[PDB]
């Protein structure tokens, strides 16, 4: 019941945050693929367009800061 | 090796400007790769997992020249005297 | 940087340090003067620091530990074997004919265009004072009072690393592992010093001492007891705590009392 393959995207640009504020949990970790149901090609592009934003200071690393 | 740097060797050595499959073309397209790749192994001498491609290219060019040496000995001497290959 | 081949006892252990970048010729003429071998004896004509005397004729080469000329660029010309210090010395031609000697950084050759002064761009070879250098970049020729001359970090292969730029002071870390405060406007030079493998050189034999001007050294428990505390014994005996010639302990006892400089020593070398 995926989202990316459904909507027909080809790249997950990290510079959108209104999407990635669904695919991170409360603490700031990444919710696994057998829970969001994302296909396992776009899960890798998700796990890199989160780790770019965590560097570029749009998404936290933990809950505290 | 870039596209317009192989489409120069195809036109230099290729008898149709389309053929891309001749034996002299398939030796020149490896020698103008090895002699360009020698200036990458002068900086990174520990790169064995991309030295295996170089040993592959060398020992396949040796086979594609020893085919030519017994097929047509006329072409083989002028091919090595054009490329500089000693043997 | 090769071992010499064992033809005969005397070259069995030699590791040279050879370098083909150097100048195989004569030094620059208006930069020499006389540095005669003082022989370890002062005006009173007595041996004060021992072991010294002998060797080869060491003609001094003048060298610019100040680098005062701001603004003007400076091409390098060649390198030479200055036999005073254990570094190598570059010969520099400025844009208006003035030649000088400077210390040689690690990435130096014939073709570099260095530039001294306040507004120098950041590249190894350049110099600029330490309120425009960025933090972390390792420097040599660090001065302790602004304008005196290059004093800190001036050997064969040393460096000091700027770690903090607070107030109107900077904090270094010297090569002997001791932190140090320096006035924030002393004239430092970026990058290390070139000839980094002098410590690999094993000299090989006795003769490479007395071609460098070091005499023999007689250890303490050889002598008879009017010349050193360690003497005596009808055979071998060393039944006393290890001392200098002149009474003082040597195996650990600290001897620093220069109490006018302790504003700047942040932590001792451990």
């Amino acid at each position: 019941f995926c989202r990316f393959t459904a909507e027909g995207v080809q790249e997950i640009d990290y510079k959108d945050i209104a999407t990635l504020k669904n695919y991170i949990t409360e603490s700031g970790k990444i919710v696994p693929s057998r829970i969001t149901g994302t296909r396992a090609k776009y899960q890798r592009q998700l796990a890199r367009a989160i780790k770019r934003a965590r560097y570029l200071s749009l998404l936290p690393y933990t809950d505290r800061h | 090796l870039s596209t317009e740097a192989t489409a120069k060797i195809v036109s230099e050595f290729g008898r149709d400007a389309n053929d891309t499959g001749s034996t002299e073309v398939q030796v020149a397209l490896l020698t103008a790769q090895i002699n360009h790749l020698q200036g990458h192994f002068a900086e990174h001498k520990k790169d064995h997992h991309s030295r295996r491609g170089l040993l592959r290219m060398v020992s396949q060019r040796r086979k594609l020249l020893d085919y030519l040496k017994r097929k047509d000995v006329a072409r083989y001497t002028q091919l090595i005297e054009r490329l500089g290959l000693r043997r | 940087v090769v071992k010499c081949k064992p033809t005969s006892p005397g070259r069995r252990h030699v590791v040279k340090v050879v370098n083909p970048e150097l100048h195989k010729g004569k030094p620059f003429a208006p930069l020499l003067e006389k540095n005669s071998k003082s022989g370890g004896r002062n005006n009173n004509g007595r041996i004060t620091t021992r072991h010294i005397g002998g060797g080869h004729k060491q003609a001094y080469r003048i060298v610019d530990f100040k680098r005062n000329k701001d603004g003007i660029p400076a091409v390098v010309e060649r390198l030479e074997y200055d036999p005073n210090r254990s570094a190598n010395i570059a010969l520099v031609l400025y844009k208006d004919g003035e030649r000088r000697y400077i210390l040689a950084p690690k990435g130096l050759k014939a073709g570099d265009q260095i530039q001294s002064g306040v507004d120098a761009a950041i590249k190894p070879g350049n110099t600029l004072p330490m309120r425009n250098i960025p933090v972390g970049s390792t420097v040599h020729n660090v001065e302790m009072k602004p304008g005196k001359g290059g004093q800190l970090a001036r050997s064969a292969g040393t460096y000091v690393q700027i770690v903090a730029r607070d107030g109107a002071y900077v904090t270094l870390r010297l090569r002997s592992g001791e932190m140090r405060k320096v006035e924030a406007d002393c004239r430092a030079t970026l990058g290390e010093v070139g000839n980094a493998e002098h410590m690999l050189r094993v000299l090989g034999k006795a003769g490479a001492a007395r071609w460098r001007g070091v005499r023999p050294t007689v250890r303490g428990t050889a002598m008879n007891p009017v010349d050193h505390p360690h003497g005596g014994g009808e055979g071998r005996n060393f039944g006393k705590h290890p001392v200098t010639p002149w009474g003082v302990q040597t195996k650990g006892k600290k001897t620093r009392s220069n109490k006018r400089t302790d504003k700047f020593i942040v932590r001792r070398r451990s």
């Binding site: 640009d13 510079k15 959108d16 945050i17 770019r52 560097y55 570029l56 200071s57 749009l58 998404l59 936290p60 690393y61 800061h65 | - | 950041i122 960025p134």
Partner: protein, 104 residues
């Protein structure tokens, strides 16, 4: 002529030097015959962690095509300059010219 997606973060006290930075970093590319595709300011943005002990920084996105030399220069200005706090330069394989997702 490989394209590039650069982004840098300047300090909000020095937030009045960004037209200087934009019209001085168009120089080293467009005078270096690399075309300039899209170029946006993002204003001041709340961070979500401390970086150099502050909380609001200033983002500029610059998506530009260049020869491989001048971009290999353009990181040194960001490093030895201390106006900018962070900079990321990615190698986009093609030439994007859409509006940024956070212009809305």
């Amino acid at each position: 002529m490989r394209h590039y997606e650069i982004v840098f973060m300047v300090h909000p006290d020095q937030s009045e030097q960004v037209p200087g930075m934009i019209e001085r970093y168009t120089a080293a590319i467009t005078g270096a015959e690399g075309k300039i595709h899209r170029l946006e300011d993002w204003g001041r943005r709340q961070l979500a962690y401390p970086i150099n002990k502050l909380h609001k920084a200033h983002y500029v996105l610059m998506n530009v095509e260049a020869p491989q030399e001048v971009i290999d220069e353009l990181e040194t200005t960001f490093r030895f300059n201390d106006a900018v706090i962070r900079s990321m330069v990615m190698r986009t394989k093609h030439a994007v010219t859409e509006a940024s997702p956070m212009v809305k």
